[PDB]
């Protein structure tokens, strides 16, 4: 419930919306350099172009950083990065992010079938997925539920849209999969704290319709300018 988190997730949601409108799954990434508050890379699902089942948002953003900074660059900077994703990283992405030693993940809605930050596995706090520098597994935090409703709604749009081819009620939020009540209240306010962790319900009260219903065709050009600014600040 930090406001930088709202800000950056809003960006992620705009990008996911763009993904929806280009016939792709609305999972989208914003890699933020936490010490400066700067947007350093972005991602969208890209399995339509790649024809592989591995070209996920996070992967796209890892490539962008590798291109901007080189391999050494990626490995060096990554511990300083806060990732913002609309949907919880899948096990595969959660594991890649673990191995690269990411600072932190903030996500919207859980990933019901493949979620590797608590929903199906907790790769981010496991013991078999290591940081190679020192073969460690201290882990990373993954903050759930930031614009959860928005992420869920974008997915519903996708499911409906997907069917167009040639021939509110949001689920209970099992928060205890992603943090302990103490870790909840350190993460969120004490008012929202008690009530929300307790009743298995979402932090918010109305769906931001303008954000998810309006198109974002300029989003790429916006993120490009912002990314190149970060590059000139390096």
């Amino acid at each position: 419930a930090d406001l930088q988190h709202i800000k950056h997730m809003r960006t992620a949601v705009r990008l996911a919306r763009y993904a929806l409108d280009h016939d792709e799954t609305p999972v989208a990434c914003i890699f933020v350099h936490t010490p400066t508050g700067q947007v350093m890379a972005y991602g969208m699902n890209d399995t339509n172009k790649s024809l592989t089942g591995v070209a996920h948002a996070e992967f796209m953003g890892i490539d962008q950083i590798k291109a901007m900074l080189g391999s050494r660059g990626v490995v060096d900077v990554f511990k300083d990065i806060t990732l913002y994703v609309t949907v919880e990283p899948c096990i595969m992405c959660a594991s890649a992010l673990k191995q690269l030693d990411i600072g932190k993940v903030v996500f919207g809605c859980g990933n019901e079938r493949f979620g590797g930050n608590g929903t199906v596995l907790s790769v981010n706090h496991d013991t078999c997925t290591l940081v190679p520098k020192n073969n460690s597994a201290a882990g990373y935090e993954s903050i759930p539920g930031i614009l959860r409703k928005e992420a869920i709604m974008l997915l519903r749009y996708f499911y409906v849209r997907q069917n167009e081819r040639a021939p509110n009620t949001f689920p209970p939020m099992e928060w205890s999969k992603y943090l302990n009540e103490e870790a909840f209240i350190e993460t969120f306010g004490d008012d929202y704290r008690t009530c929300f962790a307790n009743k298995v319900d979402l932090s918010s009260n109305s769906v931001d319709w303008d954000l998810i219903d309006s198109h974002q065709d300029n989003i790429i050009q916006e993120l490009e300018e912002q990314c190149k600014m970060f590059k000139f600040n390096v």
Binding site: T52, K66, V75, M92, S95, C128, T129, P132
Partner: protein, 284 residues
């Protein structure tokens, strides 16, 4: 055809079946989409719900003693105008689940039917494994610090097998450039080029994959997304492996009911095909 040791899940003294036992104890339920009738209707409905409801349902409900009957709204009542997602492993578990949720048909350990249905070409397996291993030792002999190999065979066996060395040996590499990932990207780029791929090529669907080393959590899940049929590996990685029950945190990613998808997995437990020593902390 094949010698099966049903006791231990070892095929031909060499292929050790890899799957999960902890999770086979608990039941993963569904709701009862029931139907109530009297016996005369029963025989007519069981015909209708037999041919379509078994032939068409994406779930496999053949372990359910369907007699107080459930086919599996529009297509359902149109045809009806005429008038444990998974089996348990023990008889005890069968009887208890029978009364807890629904009568089930007990037909022995369902893993016995799985081992029997495994269609395996023993010589192909040996071949690919010999190939990956010989490369592995070459790589090690060459000083390469990540002497791991993945070999991707397509369903038809007519395309060129894709041979993928670990990327962390290469110049501009990331810690996540593991051999399974590389081979997956290679198959993808082969589809993208389109010279040797039909319009019914999709992902690595029904590919078999041969690894010198048990894959990490990223790679395991990566093969789930790529919809491969089978993985066969040589070296277990207790610290990092994500297939064997006793490797890693027991992810058993090939055989996790919570995902919608599985693949068959085997370890080779003979000594014929030695590989390059890898540090045990290495993911992959």
């Amino acid at each position: 055809p094949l010698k099966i040791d049903y006791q231990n899940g070892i095929i031909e003294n060499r292929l050790l079946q890899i799957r999960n036992f902890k999770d086979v104890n608990t039941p993963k339920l569904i709701n009862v989409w029931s139907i109530r009738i009297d016996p005369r209707d029963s025989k007519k409905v069981i015909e209708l719900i037999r041919n379509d409801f078994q032939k068409n349902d994406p779930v496999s409900l053949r372990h359910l003693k369907r007699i107080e009957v459930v086919l599996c709204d529009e297509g359902e009542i149109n045809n009806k105008l005429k008038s444990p997602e998974f089996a348990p492993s023990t008889k005890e578990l069968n009887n208890a689940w029978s009364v807890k949720y629904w009568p089930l048909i007990w037909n022995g350990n369902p893993n016995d039917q799985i081992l029997n249905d495994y269609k395996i070409d023993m010589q192909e397996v040996r071949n690919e494994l010999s190939r990956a291993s010989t490369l592995s030792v070459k790589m090690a002999t060459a000083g390469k610090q990540f002497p791991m190999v993945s070999v991707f065979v397509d369903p038809s066996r007519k395309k060129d097998k894709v041979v993928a060395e670990d990327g962390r040996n290469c110049e501009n590499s990331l810690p996540i450039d593991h051999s399974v990932m590389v081979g997956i990207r290679a198959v993808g780029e082969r589809l993208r080029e389109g010279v040797d791929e039909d319009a019914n090529s999709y992902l690595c669907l029904d590919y078999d994959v041969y690894l010198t080393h048990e894959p990490c959590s990223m790679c395991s899940m990566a093969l789930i997304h790529s919809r491969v049929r089978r993985v066969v590996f040589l070296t277990e990685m207790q610290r990092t492996g994500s297939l064997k029950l006793t490797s890693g945190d027991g992810y058993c990613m090939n055989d996790n009911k919570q995902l919608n998808s599985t693949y068959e997995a085997f370890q080779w437990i003979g000594e014929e095909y030695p590989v390059g020593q890898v540090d045990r902390d290495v993911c992959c």
